[PDB]
């Protein structure tokens, strides 16, 4: 069961490090009154579906 | 022990030739009042972390 628990404490860590790298790469694009650079729309799932 | 000394006089030489090539490639960028061209920030570990 410890191996059944070392999965969930090692599959959340690799999911935590994508949400952080998703955040830090597009946080200035949400602060300005500007666009999203639609290449990064394709690669990163951005919250501006097209809005804000 | 001579082979134990011909390592350190052949692992410092290949480290000396990176510090020289790090120096000569970005020495004008430190003299001018200018930026660092952030591609070379990625490849070369530049002392302007972003400053000067």
């Amino acid at each position: 069961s410890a191996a059944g628990l070392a999965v969930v404490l090692s599959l959340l860590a690799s999911c935590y490090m994508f949400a952080t790298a998703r955040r830090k790469c597009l946080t200035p694009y949400a602060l300005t009154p500007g666009a999203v650079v639609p290449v990064t729309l394709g690669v990163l799932c951005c919250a501006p579906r097209a809005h804000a | 022990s001579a082979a134990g000394l011909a390592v350190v006089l052949s692992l410092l030489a290949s480290c000396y030739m990176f510090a020289t090539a790090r120096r000569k490639c970005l020495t004008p960028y430190a003299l001018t009042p200018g930026a660092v061209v952030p591609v070379t920030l990625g490849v070369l570990c530049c002392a302007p972390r972003a400053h000067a």
Binding site: S10, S14, T20, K24 | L41, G42
Partner: peptide, 29 residues
């Protein structure tokens, strides 16, 4: 067991391999 701990053992070092590269770029700019 090596197949289980080699998949998400190899997923995790790729998740660090992004975040080392992203903080190398968007600290610089």
């Amino acid at each position: 067991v090596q197949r289980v701990a080699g998949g998400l053992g190899g997923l995790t070092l790729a998740a660090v391999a992004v975040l080392i590269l992203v903080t190398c770029v968007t600290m610089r700019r």
